[PDB]
């Protein structure tokens, strides 16, 4: 069939597509995350992400876990500074039980003191696992330096708050951010009336348009971590655009022109301009990619470089010089067209999977309150002009820079020097 998009009177978007697939996936997308947090309640989002299996009014933790395993389904919470998504996946027959569990988790959380106290340890383990890849620490520090407020808040609980997150804070977060107007219920493999019935049964009680955080302000600062790792991971970013704007599409096209993540395994990223520009100057192992992060109120664009400690400055400066090259107008139409093709293929491949389609539909519903078919997004992508890409490069070059680097910072440059 086709996706059915409905906005209920309370403000809750329910979207259902019947793919007639053996597995049904239903996800509730809530406009709550690290961004919607203040200094006092930092880290609440992380514990909320880890608190899916805790006891709820409808069902006990034992019931939730045991039943979800018994049907073989999976409950997962995927968190983004601006959004938090609860997704339940199971066979088409058993979807209703997992839907009951999911709505109990989201709408009727009973954060009993002992259970919440038990989960406090899991925050440290999860942060340790996530930070094993240095780029997570690099990105968290990058967001901290770029923004004074809102988006600066990390996706992981601050260390000083690891054991001090209180059940009352979780209740306050749920009540003031888990609201109907901030929620979208997207289901693949389920009928629209069933989804409407479930949403009416559970989510109706909470009032919409809850507490709204302050608009992100651009700090434009540098955070440097000396950890002694042989490879220096550094990111130089500037405020680019908010998601859904034409400038955002221009910035995505620029990201692909400079070079997004690699395509050929063990490849040289030959088409990528940044990789070739850095390779011409640096003959040691290196890694350079274009960083584009688009958020509702703001966006960051820049270069992410992994390099040996001695040669980190050379890599950073070479990538910045290539971006300057693009800004000065040395951009070929063929390269722009190739970037557009790569962007369109990337969007299609992202929506290829059930998880990708569910996430995309939920993100569109939350950000824009409507669903755009892939064809329209491709038309938007090809609407971008080369002059717009050059102007986005100019905006990056001229704009104030925020940098985060981790490793043997050593010869790594400072933002002022850049």
């Amino acid at each position: 069939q086709d996706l059915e998009f409905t906005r209920l009177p309370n403000g809750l978007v329910i979207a259902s597509l019947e793919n007639y697939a053996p597995a049904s996936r239903i996800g509730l997308f809530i406009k709550a995350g690290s961004r919607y947090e203040d200094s006092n309640n930092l880290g609440t989002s992380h514990l909320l992400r880890l608190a899916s299996s805790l006891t709820t009014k409808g069902a006990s933790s034992f019931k939730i876990t045991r039943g979800i395993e018994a049907v073989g389904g999976k409950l997962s919470v995927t968190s983004t500074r601006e959004s938090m998504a609860y997704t339940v996946e199971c066979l088409r027959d058993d979807i209703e039980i997992l839907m009951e569990f999911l709505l109990n988790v989201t709408a009727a959380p009973e954060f009993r003191r002992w259970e919440v106290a038990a989960l406090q340890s899991q925050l440290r383990i999860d942060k340790a696992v996530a930070f094993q890849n240095p780029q997570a620490q690099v990105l968290e520090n990058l967001h901290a330096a770029a923004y004074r407020n809102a988006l600066a808040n990390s996706l992981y609980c601050p260390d000083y708050r690891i054991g001090k997150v209180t059940p009352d804070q979780l209740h306050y977060y749920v009540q003031n951010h888990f609201t109907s107007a901030r929620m979208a219920l997207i289901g693949l493999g389920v009928s629209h009336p069933v989804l409407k019935q479930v949403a009416e049964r559970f989510l109706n009680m909470r009032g919409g348009l809850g507490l709204s955080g302050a608009k992100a302000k651009y700090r434009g600062g540098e955070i440097r971590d000396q950890n002694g790792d042989s490879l220096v991971h550094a990111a130089l970013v500037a405020e680019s655009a908010a998601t859904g704007s034409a400038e955002a599409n221009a910035f995505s096209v620029l990201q692909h022109v400079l070079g997004a993540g690699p395509h050929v395994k063990r490849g040289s990223n030959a088409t990528s301009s940044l990789y070739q520009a850095v390779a011409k100057g640096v003959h040691q192992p290196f890694d350079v990619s274009a960083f584009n992060a688009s958020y509702s109120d703001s966006g960051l664009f820049g270069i992410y470089t992994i390099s040996q400690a001695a040669s980190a400055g050379d890599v950073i400066k070479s990538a910045y010089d290539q971006v300057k090259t693009i800004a000065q107008g040395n951009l070929s139409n063929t390269d722009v067209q190739a970037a557009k093709n790569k962007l369109k293929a990337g969007y299609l491949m992202s929506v290829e999977s059930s998880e990708g389609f569910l996430d995309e539909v939920g993100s569109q519903a939350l950000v824009a309150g409507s669903y755009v078919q892939p064809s329209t997004v491709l038309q938007q992508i090809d609407s971008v002009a080369d002059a717009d890409v050059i102007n986005a490069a100019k905006k990056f070059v001229s704009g104030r820079k925020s940098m985060a680097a981790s490793g043997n910072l050593g010869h790594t440059p400072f933002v002022d020097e850049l």
């Binding site: 034992f62 019931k63 003191r113 002992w114």
Partner: protein, 101 residues
């Protein structure tokens, strides 16, 4: 109800946990369910229970009873542990039912 309450009060006074300052839940046998219920108690209640038990043990060490004015009254005896113990027993019963089938 009044007759049952009168007999219950007679039993309460006949038992001496009131004389030692203890409340009824202070005297429960610490089985695993009771241990979990105590673990779940709020800090204030846990500390109050600990001090009441310690005072009762000290009084029994010297074979003494608390002054009659300080005896716990039948009306004012508060079953602090009963809700936590009920929740614990409910969880255990649910687990056993799941194990049965």
């Amino acid at each position: 109800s009044k007759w049952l309450e009168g007999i219950r009060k007679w039993y309460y006074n006949a038992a001496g946990f009131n004389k030692l300052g203890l409340m009824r839940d202070d005297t429960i046998y610490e089985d695993d369910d009771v241990k979990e219920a105590i673990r779940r108690l709020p800090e204030n209640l846990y500390n109050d229970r600990v001090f009441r038990i310690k005072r009762a043990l000290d009084l029994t060490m010297r074979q003494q009873i608390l002054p009659k004015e300080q005896w716990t009254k039948y009306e004012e005896d508060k079953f602090y542990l009963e809700p936590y113990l009920k929740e614990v027993i409910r969880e255990r019963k649910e687990r056993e039912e799941w194990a049965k089938k």
